[PDB]
Amino acid sequence: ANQASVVANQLIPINSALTLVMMRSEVVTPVGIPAEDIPRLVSMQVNRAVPLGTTLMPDMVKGYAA
């Protein structure tokens, strides 16, 4: 409905630090990390490969807590 999540704009390899080109905002279901937090995600690492178009979930980001 109106809440957007962070979605991978490219494949993100396992253990890569997130950069802004990697993250778009889209209204997807199920809901993942709120698109509002994209600034705060830069430089944090993902703990698994995230294919293009996959919603980024809290458990995929090392050290994420919000």
Swiss-Prot record:
Q: Does the keyword Secreted apply?
A: yes
The Gene Ontology CC terms held by the record are: extracellular region
Q: Which residues form the AFP-like domain?
A: 5-64
Q: Which InterPro entries match?
A: AFP_Neu5c_C, AFP_Neu5c_C_sf, Antifreeze_III
Subcellular location, record wording: Secreted
- What UniProt keywords are attached to this protein's entry? Antifreeze protein, Secreted
Q: Which residues cross the membrane?
A: none
Positions marked as site (Important for ice-binding): 10, 15, 19, 45
Provide the tissue specificity. Detected in blood serum (at protein level).
Q: Which family does it belong to?
A: Belongs to the type-III AFP family.
Function of the molecule: Contributes to protect fish blood from freezing at subzero sea water temperatures. Lowers the blood freezing point. Binds to nascent ice crystals and prevents further growth.
Question: This protein is called what?
Answer: Type-3 ice-structuring protein HPLC 12
The organism that produces this protein has a lineage beginning with: Eukaryota, Metazoa, Chordata, Craniata, Vertebrata
